[PDB]
Amino acid sequence: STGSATTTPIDSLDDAYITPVQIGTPAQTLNLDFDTGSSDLWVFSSETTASEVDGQTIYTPSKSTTAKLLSGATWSISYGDGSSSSGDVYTDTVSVGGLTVTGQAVESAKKVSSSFTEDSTIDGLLGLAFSTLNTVSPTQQKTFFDNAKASLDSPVFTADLGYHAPGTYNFGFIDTTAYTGSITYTAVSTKQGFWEWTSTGYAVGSGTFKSTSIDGIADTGTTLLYLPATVVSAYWAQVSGAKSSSSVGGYVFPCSATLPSFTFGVGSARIVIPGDYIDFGPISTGSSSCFGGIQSSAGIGINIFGDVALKAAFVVFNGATTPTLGFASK
């Protein structure tokens, strides 16, 4: 089997991407944030504290003839950005772009933190990291991908995120029309439950390539590119007037600037992030200070190849017995 679904930016900055997901019988379509950095499929629901729902579409398990309470199961998750959610668990039928999993754990939120409430466009998350990170207790549950894997034509999914435009998540096949040149594959460590890999280096603008190993995670659920302070300083040094602002929470730059590109290495291959992809706009409405899309990972504890990086590539998440990651230009 295969599936193919369009993923759409939630706003004009590409702060996140939403993908429609069918849950239950009859189908209830929710728009979920596909997140290769976590492993829970959770939704706003009829069980979510009413004051914490503000415009989201909710899953109502009592209206699904295939929903079953997973007795005694609870979940609770905290994300890198400080947001969180928790609740109980149903199993139900879940379909993405024509690919159907029966018996998928659907984690129903009883509580969500303010950042979730405040984002009316995201109805929940669909985790695509390794199932070892799933938070359901006392019986850990599998991700949608893990459940689908054996049925797929090939045990892979691909992320093709757009810049200020829709893109595609495919399951079970590689669309050879969706990228240019060849796909370069690179090793993955699953030791921390992430799609963790090692970039071979970077360049800033038209500058020379610096060969250096940068361990990090391919994370569709993180907006920005978070890299070591040395790398980030070298980038922003090429932008007149750019500076790190403790008050704002990272590097800012004059909105009048033209940003240089940033290149990262995948083996001997190179992925070029255009400068415009690094512009996250005014820090507040009407400001001439703009927020940067490349930020320091210092104090995160891990480097994160988030959407800024991934949207410059066609990315293969190969879930073979020994997982790997592939990157192609597009």
UniProtKB/Swiss-Prot annotation:
GO terms for molecular function: aspartic-type endopeptidase activity. The active site is at residues 35, 199. It catalyses: Hydrolysis of proteins with specificity similar to that of pepsin A, prefers hydrophobic residues at P1 and P1', but does not cleave 14-Ala-|-Leu-15 in the B chain of insulin or Z-Glu-Tyr. Clots milk. Its EC number is 3.4.23.22. This is Endothiapepsin. It comes from Cryphonectria parasitica. Belongs to the peptidase A1 family. The chain holds residues 90 to 419 of 419 of the full protein. Disulfide bonds join 255-290. Residues 17-328 form the Peptidase A1 domain. Keywords: Aspartyl protease, Disulfide bond, Hydrolase, Protease, Signal, Zymogen. GO terms for biological process: proteolysis.
